[PDB]
Design a protein around this ligand. Structure first.
Ligand SMILES: Nc1ncnc2c1ncn2[C@@H]1O[C@H](COP(=O)(O)OP(=O)(O)OP(=O)(O)O)[C@@H](O)[C@H]1O
Lengths: 393, 827, 98
């Protein structure tokens, strides 16, 4: 379809018309939108042992620690011993086997979130245990592995897998547990959040989330992180760069220039944008080219492309919701709490109108340019065309 | 049997090699202007025979079937040398003098520079009671050194009693120079002085007795080979206040032999962009520049080439406009293409090429090839000096017999000797503490390329050039460049070396295994990973594969018994083959920390520099094994998984090493449980870096003391706490040119920036140009300006509650150029 | 096989031609008054030899049987070169001012 731009208007006395439905329905319960319950995961913490018995005959320790995980999930243990018991498995496991391995770890880390959100875990204990360097890379690999396990499969067929952003991941309703790990740590230690984001993005590249044929010149190396930390603690090092730093500036400006072009290939531009945007988000003022940005509108182009990724992610979430009524991902929704096939009356009054305003919101403050049009306008048009030919069916 | 005759002929070949190299060095001294063409042709043929017999003897050395081949080749080359013998028997003023006579109102931008030279010497002429001083002017090739001296000279002559210009050539005659000095002082009493023939000494005595009770201002220029100037300085050895001297030279190692003071040395720089443009438009253009508006970009790009050298621009402008701009926008581009490879083959331009070749001829031997080697690399790019050093060593350009030198420091000395001869610009500082890379002037680079191509020294394939030699067989050095079209490689069998510059044509058109003999292989920047044929190459020395997408390398690397370099940065390989201990000779191993080294590294006894050794999942024997091989000079270490008493074991095993010059250890966010406080460091050490910032020491290391390791010039240290006595202890150290300290607890805990003080001593910092303090308050009211005489930048932290305090005593101009600083302030 | 010796002797011919023109140009500078007649005779003879060598190399280059012809001719001209060699070693104001 050549569906024209969804021109709408989101004002007062219309915000709560759909958000009130979003305030109590199954989706959007643990999310947010741009315009701005223990039983659900308890049942999965019980069903963790569905198919494990089937292929025991090699696999026995999987069932053995599945039993231990279920035991720790329901039992109440004082915080100074619960963390040690649960790290017994976190600090022993190394590696059809591996799918079950991460599920043990993924559900293990949610226990800390479950007890911390229940005020069972003191904030000081969490702050003392998050300084451990091992768990930062551990969680960095677990997040990306679990995501590429389930949402990558649905995004690839959706055509939106090309616009997956590393930093823009906490918004997922399943991954509603990372808000605490991010906020508490960053308002307690800013450097460590940037460190873990850097590790996570490096793991994302090495694991094929943003593949390339060229080596990572900013990630997977200790020299880089040492230099970035030194810059973050020295506000006047860009003025007089030293050794190993001229090359970083050269490479970053090559990346920025390559992004700024229009007729070169798209995949490398998206990859460079991913790495660079992560770079500023975790390290402010690294690319303060106050002369080129003024003549290039680059700074605003950052918000344009980031909001494009945001709206495309939300569109993918809406698609995975509407087709469900398992694309929600493995170990995401149990069989009993599943959503059947029959259509529900509240969707006709809160879905077409909601996606109508969503597109209008992103198409109300985005600049239009030949470089941006192939990065923002064309994906928006293709998403609109695909999303306006599947709602009635 | 058969081996004895060849084993006997080899050293006869070697004796002939020595004799030929001697005569070749002798014949290459003369400029190619007084040398007859017959001797030159014979010399070229001799040079070709020199290469052939070197190749034969090297083949013998590496190989020892083949003996028959060696014997046949040896007899053949003997017949060739014989036959070349009888052919030879059978058939048998200063260019810059004119410049000195140039119209004064023809020099643009001179007066301000002249004033700077005048008031740096006459400021003491006010109260002309000061002891005499000399002002030395340095530079490269020709950029105003003699003229500037004359402008100053012709200005201040009323306020003296004597004075004269005297020139000294490449090879002076001391009596002539002294007679010139005598003649210029007085032309009446010494009118016929050039006829008097006493000696070098009585006329020195006469010149001394003449200059008693007089202020003169004698100026001597073009002094080369400092040993010559030690004679003149004896003429100037009596006290004479208010008198002064000027010296001009292209050697910056002779200027410190004058005036004994670095503030008197006058480094002088090329003209600025606009001044050079004004000069350029003064010659060609009559009075206006707004007419062309179409070749303005061409003039920009031309002036960029010459850079700032008043000479180059004067010559090019004279060439460009004989009478009213006889050329426009077509042959301007033809000239631009011609420069870089073939511009000098023209008329009225050969005048300056002698002025540039002066320095090349003054070079000793064993340095002409080193300078000529620079013609390989492209027009405008920084050249890492380590690459040059290793390539020189592998080529055979560096050699000695002293056995007290590791043959690498020798190459570094050669590079520094090139630098101080004012021929290559050094720029930047590397991670080892020395010059990072070098750059050569565009005119000089193109001029030397032609000189190298006059023989078969190198061969370059360039699209602007697009030219080939007539004899494909006699090719030794190749430099593939942007050209990717005519890549014939059939008749180059004895190829000494090959390198490729940023080309994707490599591999798919190139066939390197066909080069049966090959000495170095350089593959910077290529995107080819098909290395499976280097086992066939057995003469290889240098193998560079930085950034080459090499995923894996053949198992039979061990066969390359001769080898000196492996650079493996930026490669995709993550594990070295076990067949690397089999290597017997090596001096450098450039590896990244990701790769895993096989056991047995202790057998690489000759290893000279190691870079980025990764220590992850390492056992005790491997850690101890590095200590048996003690020849390292640079070592870089990082690790993630052995932080135990193995750390102390390695820390003790390092002390076995007695030749380190640099060290650096990288570790993430941890206390350094590696260095023990009861441990002797190596006697020699300069760098001792610690680039990690998340890491820290609990206390200042005890072994850091002015007594031991007295040669340090770099720290990059970081500690958890800080003390007011640690800074004082650091002030006891002799050199410590570079300073940097980080206060970990300040940036990690709630700690207040305290104000440490140096209580003991007076200065404690004789020479520390750079000083950096992060999380540590270095208030500049710590001592009067007579503490750190040379300190260009200083960093510290200033809390805002100290604004009202009285300990902030800045505002006075310290001795060094310390008026530019932006201190990081905290509320 | 056979062509190899001819090919590797040709470059010797070019080299010695270059030397012979070097000598001839050197001697041709001085006017024919300060030149001793022995040098004149030797120079004339070497000039003729140089013509002969140039003809031989030109015939080879235009042509490529005749290989044996030019091989004989080349060894033959080298023989006169050798004979002419040792003979040389065996025996040794301004007009417009008025
Ligand atoms: N400021 C200027 N303006 C115009 N022409 C200049 C200027 N400076 C130098 N030149 C000319 O450039 C040429 C450079 O010769 P110069 O006197 O610099 O030799 P030099 O510095 O002694 O170098 P060298 O050591 O090779 O003799 C001379 O012709 C000089 O007159």
């Amino acid at each position: 379809v050549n569906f024209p731009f969804p021109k709408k208007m989101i004002t007062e006395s219309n915000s709560k018309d759909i958000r009130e439905y979003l305030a109590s329905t199954f989706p959007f319960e643990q999310q947010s939108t741009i315009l701005d319950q223990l039983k659900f995961r308890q049942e999965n913490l019980a069903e963790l042992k569905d198919q494990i018995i089937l292929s025991l005959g090699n696999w026995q320790k999987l069932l053995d620690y599945t039993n231990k995980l279920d035991e720790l999930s329901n039992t109440k243990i004082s915080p100074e011993e619960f963390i040690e018991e649960i790290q017994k498995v976190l600090y022993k496991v190394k590696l059809l086997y591996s799918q079950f391995n991460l599920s043990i770890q993924d559900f293990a880390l949610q226990i800390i979130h479950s007890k911390y959100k229940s005020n069972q875990i003191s904030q000081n204990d969490l702050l003392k245990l998050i300084t451990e360097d091992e768990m930062l890379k551990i969680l960095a690999k677990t997040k990306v592995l679990t995501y590429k396990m389930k949402y990558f499969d649905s995004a690839s067929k959706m055509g939106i897998n090309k616009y997956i952003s590393t930093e823009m991941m906490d918004l997922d309703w399943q991954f509603s547990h990372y808000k605490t790990f991010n906020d508490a740590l960053k308002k307690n230690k800013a450097s460590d959040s940037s460190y873990l984001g850097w590790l996570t993005h490096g793991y994302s590249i090495k694991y094929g989330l943003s593949p390339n044929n060229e080596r990572s010149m900013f990630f997977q190396d200790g020299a880089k992180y040492a230099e970035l930390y030194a810059f973050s603690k020295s506000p006047h090092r860009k003025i007089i760069p030293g050794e190993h730093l001229k090359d970083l500036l050269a490479k970053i400006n090559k990346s920025k220039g390559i992004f700024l072009d229009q007729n070169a290939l798209l995949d490398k531009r998206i990859y460079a944008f991913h790495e660079l945007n992560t770079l500023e988000t975790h390290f402010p003022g690294i690319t303060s080219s106050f002369t080129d940005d003024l003549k290039s509108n680059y700074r605003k182009k950052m918000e344009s492309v980031s909001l494009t990724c945001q709206v495309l992610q939300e569109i993918g979430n809406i698609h995975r919701f509407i087709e469900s009524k398992t694309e929600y991902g493995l170990f995401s929704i149990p069989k009993i709490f599943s959503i059947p096939i029959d259509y529900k009356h509240g969707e006709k009054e809160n879905l077409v109108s909601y996606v109508d305003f969503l597109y209008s919101t992103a198409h109300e403050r985005i600049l239009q340019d030949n470089s941006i049009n192939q990065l923002c306008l064309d994906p928006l048009q293709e998403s609109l065309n695909r999303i306006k030919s599947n709602i009635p069916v | 049997t058969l081996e004895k005759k060849v084993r006997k002929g080899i050293e006869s070949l070697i004796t002939e090699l020595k004799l030929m190299q001697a005569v070749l060095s002798k014949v290459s001294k003369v400029p190619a202007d007084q040398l007859d063409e017959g001797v030159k042709i014979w010399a070229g043929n001799v040079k070709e025979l020199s290469y052939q017999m070197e190749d034969i003897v090297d083949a013998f050395m590496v190989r020892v079937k083949d003996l028959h081949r060696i014997s046949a080749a040896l007899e053949e080359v003997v017949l060739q040398a014989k036959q070349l013998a009888e052919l030879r028997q059978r058939y048998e003023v200063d260019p810059r003098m004119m410049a000195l006579y140039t119209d004064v109102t023809e020099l643009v931008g001179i007066e301000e520079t002249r004033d700077k030279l005048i008031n740096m010497l006459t400021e003491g002429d006010d109260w002309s009671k000061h002891p005499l001083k000399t002002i030395s002017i340095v530079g490269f090739g020709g950029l105003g050194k003699t003229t500037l001296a004359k402008a100053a000279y012709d200005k201040i002559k009323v306020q003296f009693d004597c004075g004269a210009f005297v020139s000294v050539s490449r090879n002076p005659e001391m009596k002539k120079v002294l007679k010139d000095i005598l003649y210029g002082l007085d032309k009446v009493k010494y009118e016929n002085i050039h006829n008097a023939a006493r000696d070098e000494k009585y006329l020195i005595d006469d010149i001394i007795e003449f200059l008693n009770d007089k202020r003169y201002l004698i100026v001597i220029d073009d002094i080369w080979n400092e040993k010559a100037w030690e004679l003149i300085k004896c003429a100037f050895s009596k006290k004479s206040p208010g008198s002064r001297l000027i010296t001009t030279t292209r050697n910056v190692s002779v200027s410190e032999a004058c005036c004994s003071s670095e503030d008197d040395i006058y480094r002088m720089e090329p003209l600025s962009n606009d001044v050079s443009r004004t000069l350029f438009c003064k010659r060609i253009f009559s009075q206006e520049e707004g007419c062309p508006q179409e070749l303005l970009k061409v003039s920009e790009e031309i002036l960029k080439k010459c850079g700032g050298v008043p000479l180059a621009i004067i010559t090019i402008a004279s060439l460009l406009a004989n009478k009213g701009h006889i050329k426009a926008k077509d042959e301007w581009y033809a000239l631009l293409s011609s420069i870089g490879h073939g511009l000098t083959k023209n008329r009225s331009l050969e005048q300056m090429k002698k002025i540039l070749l002066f320095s090349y001829y003054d070079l000793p031997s064993y340095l002409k090839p080193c300078l000529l080697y620079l013609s390989i690399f492209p027009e405008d790019r920084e050249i890492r000096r380590a690459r040059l050093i290793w390539r020189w060593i592998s080529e055979g350009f560096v050699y000695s017999e002293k056995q007290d030198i590791s043959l690498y420091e020798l190459g570094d000395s050669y590079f520094n000797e090139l630098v101080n001869r004012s021929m290559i610009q050094p720029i930047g500082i590397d991670d080892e503490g020395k010059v990072k890379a070098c750059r050569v002037h565009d005119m000089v680079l193109d001029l030397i390329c032609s000189l190298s191509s006059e023989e078969n020294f190198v061969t370059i394939l360039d699209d602007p050039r697009r030219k080939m030699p007539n004899s494909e067989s006699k090719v030794r050095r190749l430099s593939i460049q942007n050209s990717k079209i005519d890549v014939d490689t059939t008749r180059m069998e004895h190829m000494r070396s090959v390198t490729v510059f940023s080309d994707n044509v490599v591999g798919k058109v190139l066939d390197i295994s066909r080069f049966k003999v090959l000495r170095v292989l350089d593959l910077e920047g290529c995107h080819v990973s098909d290395v499976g044929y280097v086992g066939n190459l057995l003469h290889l020395r240098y193998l560079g594969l930085k950034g080459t997408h090499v995923k894996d390398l053949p198992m039979e690397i061990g066969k390359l018994q001769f080898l000196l370099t492996l650079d493996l940065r930026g490669t995709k390989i993550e594990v070295l083959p076990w067949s690397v201990v089999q290597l017997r000779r090596l001096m450098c191993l450039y590896v990244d920390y990701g790769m895993k080294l096989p056991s047995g590294i202790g057998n690489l006894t000759f290893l000279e520099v190691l870079d980025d050794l990764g220590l992850s999942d390492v056992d005790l024997d491997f850690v101890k094994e590095l200590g048996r091989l003690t020849k390292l000079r640079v070592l870089r270490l990082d690790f993630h998984g052995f932080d135990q008493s193995m750390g102390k074991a390695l820390e003790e095993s390092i002390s076995n090493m007695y030749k380190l010059d640099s060290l650096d250890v990288f570790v993430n966010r941890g206390l350094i449980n590696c260095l023990s406080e009861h441990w002797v460091p190596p006697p020699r050490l300069c760098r001792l870096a610690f680039p990690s910032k998340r890491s820290w020491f609990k206390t200042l290391p005890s072994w850091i003391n002015p007594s031991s390791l007295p040669l340090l010039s770099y720290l990059d240290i970081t500690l958890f706490e800080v003390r007011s006595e640690d800074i004082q202890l650091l002030g006891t150290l002799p050199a410590l040119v570079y300073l940097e300290i980080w206060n970990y607890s300040v940036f990690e805990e709630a700690h207040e920036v305290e104000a440490p003080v140096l209580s003991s001593g007076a200065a404690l910092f004789p020479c520390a140009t750079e000083c950096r303090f992060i999380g540590i308050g270095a208030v500049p009211s710590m001592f009067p300006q007579g503490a750190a005489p040379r300190l260009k930048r200083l960093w510290f932290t200033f809390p805002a509650k100290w604004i009202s305090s009285e300990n902030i005593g800045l505002g006075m101009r310290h001795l060094p150029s310390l008026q530019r600083v932006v201190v990081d302030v905290i509320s």
